[PDB]
Amino acid sequence: AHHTDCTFIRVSGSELVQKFIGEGARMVRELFVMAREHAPSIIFMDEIDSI
Amino acid sequence: KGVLMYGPPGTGKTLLARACAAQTKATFLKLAGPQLVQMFIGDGAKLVRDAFALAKEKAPSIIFIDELDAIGT
Amino acid sequence: EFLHAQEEVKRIQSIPLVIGQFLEAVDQNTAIVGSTTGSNYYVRILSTIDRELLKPNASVALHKHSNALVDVLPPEADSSIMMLTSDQKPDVMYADIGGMDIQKQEVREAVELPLTHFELYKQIGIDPPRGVLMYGPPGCGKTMLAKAVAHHTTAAFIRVVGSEFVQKYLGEGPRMVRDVFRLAKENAPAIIFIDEIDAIATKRFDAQTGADREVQRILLELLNQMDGFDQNVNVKVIMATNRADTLDPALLRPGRLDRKIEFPLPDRRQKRLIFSTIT
Amino acid sequence: GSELVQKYVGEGARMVRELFEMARTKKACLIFFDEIDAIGGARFDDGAGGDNEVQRTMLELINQLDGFDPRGNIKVLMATNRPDTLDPALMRPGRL
Amino acid sequence: LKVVSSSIVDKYIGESARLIREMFNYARDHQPCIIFMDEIDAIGGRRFSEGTSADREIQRTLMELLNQMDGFDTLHRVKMIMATNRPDTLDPALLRP
Amino acid sequence: ASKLPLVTPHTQCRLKLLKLERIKDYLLMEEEFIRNQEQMKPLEEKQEEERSKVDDLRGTPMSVGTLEEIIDDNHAIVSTSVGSEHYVSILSFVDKDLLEPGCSVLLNHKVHAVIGVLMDDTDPLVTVMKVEKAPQETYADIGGLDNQIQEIKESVELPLTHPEYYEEMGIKPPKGVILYGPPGTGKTLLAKAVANQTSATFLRVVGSELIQKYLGDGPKLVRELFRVAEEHAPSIVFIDEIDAIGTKRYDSNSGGEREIQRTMLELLNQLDGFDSRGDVKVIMATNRIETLDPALIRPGRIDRKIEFPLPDEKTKKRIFQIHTSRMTLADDVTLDDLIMAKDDLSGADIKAICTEAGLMALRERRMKVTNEDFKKSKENVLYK
Amino acid sequence: LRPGRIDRKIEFPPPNEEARLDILKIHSRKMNLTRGINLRKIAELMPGASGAEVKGVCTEAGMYALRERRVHVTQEDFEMAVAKVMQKDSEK
Amino acid sequence: LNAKVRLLREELQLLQEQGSYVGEVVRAMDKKKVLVKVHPEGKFVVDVDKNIDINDVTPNCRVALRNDSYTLHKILPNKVDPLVSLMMVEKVPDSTYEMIGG
Ligand SMILES: Nc1ncnc2c1ncn2[C@@H]1O[C@H](COP(=O)(O)OP(=O)(O)OP(=O)(O)O)[C@@H](O)[C@H]1O
Ligand SMILES: Nc1ncnc2c1ncn2[C@@H]1O[C@H](COP(=O)(O)OP(=O)(O)OP(=O)(O)O)[C@@H](O)[C@H]1O
Ligand SMILES: Nc1ncnc2c1ncn2[C@@H]1O[C@H](COP(=O)(O)OP(=O)(O)O)[C@@H](O)[C@H]1O
Ligand SMILES: [Mg+2]
């Protein structure tokens, strides 16, 4: 992501950052509203140790 | 100290409570089960102790709580 | 005449004073500052004051009516102050603790040696950790070890409780947090200590009750302040907890908690040492 | 019924009380309950307490129809597709 | 001192943990005192995982109490008495020797 | 403005000219009457003085509030942002027809009197689940089915295009449609084609998002979704993978399996309640129809059930022909060899094989694809 | 796992001897080292566990140099570090 | 020297005036109107001074509002975007190709 000059965004379903996405964020696709204004972006999600 | 009336539904429990309220001469307080549930913490016991203090203020007061199983689970 | 004129401007400093926090300086002789009342302002700076002392989070004194920046102020704090060593040294020695030499050595290497022998740490290049965490079942030496460290240390010691940062009046939490960090930074190579983090650092937040917003702001301020150090100030943060599973992972990132120490139950060899030492 | 499932504790009983107060304010008029089999089935509290706040809502609804000056000039009518799961104390005459 | 554990809780943000700190300060001033708290299961229950809001405040008060007694500062000439008729639900840390 | 819709002549006949002349004469007489008082007895500017004085009365600091209750005699109770609520008066130049409880009302700063009504602020969920532009090409890209398309057309397109056929013999169009069958068979692609061709607003949602982590949030979502759908326009609501709401359980849900039941009850209420529905069309799609509640798919809610079977050899050849139309195929490759690759091969495998073969050709910097590319592509994709 | 969803899948096998030596070489630069360490033997000692524990061994070998108040690192520290790290990971 | 002295006296005089609030603008309007929201109070719709152009007033920006009339006065430098705050909270340890082994 760094070498190709892309905005690196990662999502983990936490709640500290919930205020930075939306007031209630009943859905999850709302992140795209914050993503499509940084068009060449990459979304990265890592599976937790629960699995 | 107190009495507790129980049984299957449809038998004259509230009827006896109402008859006792009509016949007696002292102060009478009516109360329900779910009425004592509040959203904010610490706001449920306050009503209970306030009602008991108000009953204590007038000496011969008696209280009747209906649908007790909504609280004493 | 100019010498006389330069002195008549001190008429606006006698009684009207409110303490505030410097926030930003847009340009010369004009800034934006946030008073302790609870609102921000865009105000004008007095000319004769020394602009060199206006650091990012300095505390300043403002006129009551015109609400203009007037004076800079020396460092000041609240909450726990210093643990002033008179009735504060808890007279618990390292000899009374017996059997946990592994954790003792780990704590020593991760705390005390960077404070004194920083040159070796820089020369070998091992990047001393900023803070440590203690976890384990209740009853196994965490508080006693912190107590012994406080007794035997030569540096300043600040101790707080995680349940004090919540206040009835909104806005006192982040103030207390940045205030204690400011005092610890500007006094000496001190050591901050927190008991039972679990009161403020959890995983679940509900942004509708009002209290959770306060806890969220307190935690975010803690994260922001603790990340602000420049790896040049001799400050170590020791924080203790019991239920480590109910913790926010965002607080365990590198640069915030690089050391985790577990205090497990004694098995066979520590039992004899405990018995002999106590009896 | 699905409108009476709230997020905080002690909200359904408040809503029922407000409904009956507003109904009593006017002269006399009707209330309709749709899909009543979602607001109370039966008291079955075993083990860990599960599905009992809805039981408190149902108990408030029951209490508003009998005892100490019933609602009086209000007529209610309810419909459901599986009536085999309703509570015994709700189906007695005097309410249904 | 005589108090019931279910009468020291209120909806304000910091009052619940402030009242107990105040009562321990008062006990510290007059050094010989005895504190008795009835029905300790009201606030002494086990700490939930993935719990609801407006419930972690009681836990906050609980760990404040756990720190006040046998914490960083030693108590002197102070004794406490607690009573409950089902001790299963008490926190494992509160029952520690 | 529907002043006069009688333009039935629509030709060079005298009727159109006469109707236009009569309308023009009436409008000219009305304009002359309106300007007689504007030019004979003005007595004031009546154009800029009014705005000037209403601006003078309406101060430059201007706060906001929310309606709570209104009394008939032109005043109402409004609550402030801080929390205090007042008993202010309502002015007479505030077009008191859109005053609705909960609407943002613009108030004065001195006496807090009602002086205006403020527009809304869009909504940060409408733009989330609304389709802006057409996805891709229409039914010409599908191929193979040729029979489900006419049914979906009768269900959706015909009433919009020709609301006259149904009126000749007085019937109503079918209410609901559901698509089922094995996976990878072309349900979402047909939904894409319908969204492309149609002209009404398109709303979509995945069924896995109907379950939330609080109590009483699913029914709220369903209510708000259908309110939005009913308040915009003639619309189409697309809910796919609905069965996933019941075949999966998450520990993040505060309630157990009863909240799913409450959400179901709310969904049935919204689909076939008793209040006026309006004009909304619902499309559902799933691949496991044996797990849904039968009371949800009764006639009167979902009227049509459409099955998508696995393709046959002719459809397989057609899909090869479709998906390699813009690919430079060498003469060595033949589609008949790949037709018998698997016994129950589906549509998605065709695109997977073609795309990965193109990628493998791109790796070696070759514009033309060979037989070995397909031979390795099929083994790399299918057999694992 | 439907074929049309994910367009590529990439595998990350545990490092072999050459990859382990490469990671050791990469992560051994941040310390004051001594001329002649023979990192091949250290790489051969590790029975290919993962790539994070190579960094852990590197970052913990310097603690042994610190423990004797030294300014340079010798391979005795490397051997002690690898032995302790591999042994102490057996529990739990 | 004379200019310096007179400026000093006038600077003494002009320090007894009220301060000005800072606020966030949500969106503008027609005929020189904007909507702003300052945190220790609700939302205010206000006007703009004669030396500030609307097209420069982009949405979600910091401005300075006078006291008596709440009129637009200046434009504050900027506000940190939510993406920056989120990424600083997450603290992903960025790297590059030279840190790759095998
Ligand atoms: N050598 C020893 N090791 C451990 N504990 C000891 C030792 N000698 C005495 N003790 C006793 O064990 C207890 C130590 O508990 P401590 O104060 O460290 O709490 P903790 O383990 O951090 O638990 P909590 O979660 O309650 O804070 C004290 O009662 C102390 O008197
Ligand atoms: N009959 C067909 N004609 C053309 N392409 C097809 C056909 N069937 C499948 N495809 C291809 O398969 C791709 C994926 O199909 P789609 O995702 O719409 O399937 P589906 O029926 O919704 O399955 P699922 O329920 O498993 O998601 C389409 O984009 C298209 O390229
Ligand atoms: N003699 C009677 N004994 C019992 N119930 C009676 C008698 N006469 C009338 N009732 C009817 O029984 C009902 C009394 O309410 P009750 O059975 O106490 O309800 P619950 O038992 O659920 O509180 C009333 O509807 C009352 O009219
Ligand atoms: Mg009764």
Ligand SMILES: [Mg+2]
């Ligand atoms: Mg402790």
Ligand SMILES: [Mg+2]
């Ligand atoms: Mg699909």
